[PDB]
Amino acid sequence: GSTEFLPGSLIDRAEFEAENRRVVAEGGEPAAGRPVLMGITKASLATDS
């Protein structure tokens, strides 16, 4: 919706919650998420650096 998140991506929980909370004001379209499980190789290849 208004969360500029590509559907089907993987997003860190803290950032997702922060963005949804910032968008709840002056808006009405929070994004929806579902918990996911990742391995120790694809979880360490998805780092920010």
CA–CA distance, 13 with 26 (Å, rounded to integer): 22
> What is the total residue count of the chain?
49
Experimental method: cryo-EM
Q: Which two tokens stand for residue 25?
A: 């004001």
- Hunting for tokens 């920010």 — which residue is that? 48
27 CB-near residues (< 8 Å, 6+ apart) = 2
- Identify whether the C-beta of residue 38 lies closer than 8 Å to the C-beta of residue 10: yes
Q: Which two tokens stand for residue 43?
A: 């979880």
- Identify whether the C-beta of residue 5 lies closer than 8 Å to the C-beta of residue 31: yes
